[PDB]
Design a protein around this ligand. Structure first.
Ligand code: NA
Lengths: 32, 34, 31, 32
């Protein structure tokens, strides 16, 4: 269904967001 | 309205991820990581 | 250029938060 | 330190990012 597909898309995009935030955190610690 | 509201949230999440991608690329360049 | 690059990273994070705030706003309205 | 101030700012904004992402997740599950 449409609502389920969109709910799944939200979770897919949030998983990518958490990774990207984790990468910013990782790299921020290295900036010197 | 819930389909419209979820579609709009997806659009905002796409924009949010775009900006985080940009922050990652920027810091990679700063620290010299591929 | 270190400071300019961090300043730019900060601007990107401000924009990322702006868009997540908007998503939170749309979904509160939905619920 | 300019650099330290900006690194701390990155961390501050990432902490807010994580909360906002958790809220989208919480609310998406109620809408859906
Ligand atoms: Na934007």
């Amino acid at each position: 269904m449409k609502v389920k597909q969109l709910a799944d898309k939200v979770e897919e995009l949030l998983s990518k967001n958490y990774h990207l935030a984790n990468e910013v955190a990782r790299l921020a610690k290295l900036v010197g | 309205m819930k389909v419209k509201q979820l579609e709009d949230a997806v659009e905002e999440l796409l924009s949010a991820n775009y900006h985080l991608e940009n922050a990652v690329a920027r810091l990679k360049k700063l620290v010299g990581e591929r």
